[PDB]
Design a protein around this ligand. Sequence first.
Ligand code: HEM
Ligand SMILES: [O-][O-]
Length: 153
Amino acid sequence: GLSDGEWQQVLNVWGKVEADIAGHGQEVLIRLFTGHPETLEKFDKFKHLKTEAEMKASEDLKKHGTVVLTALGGILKKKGHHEAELKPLAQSHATKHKIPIKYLEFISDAIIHVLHSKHPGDFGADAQGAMTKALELFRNDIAAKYKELGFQG
Ligand code: HEM
Ligand SMILES: [O-][O-]
């Protein structure tokens, strides 16, 4: 798991996200969709977004970014004790949304990118290490639930 110090770094970084959750969420999703267009196809309600300008102008995309990062933030604040919060998300993403674990890797990478992009010089090496560990733990616990379900994608 993560040490006390590492969790503290994670939650300090998260304070930066919370100052503009919609903006961070929007940029995370745009990074995901532009870097990996196959991910956009999982969202019937975002398929019409043909260009990045359209993505940037989508108020619904910002709304969804808020929903995603709010869920993630609640999970991070549990500092690993997140079974009850994580289980339903793992199950909805496997059974309903059909999201391969690879796409969770993609979005994890997008979060790290957006943190540097929005806070250049203010996302230190220790903070990146801690946030990476937290996102890996999240992904790994989802992966365990995916294996239970026999879900691949
Ligand atoms: C940080 C990781 C993620 C978190 C915390 C997250 C969270 C959520 C939440 C809270 C919802 C609404 C409730 C639900 O359906 O369970 C949702 C819906 C959804 N998620 Fe995710 N999600 C994540 C990653 C992804 C990724 C990587 C994809 C696809 C590439 C994805 C695809 C979807 C889709 C298609 C919906 C339904 C959207 C709609 O039509 O309203 N999710 N997600
Ligand atoms: O996308 O959640």
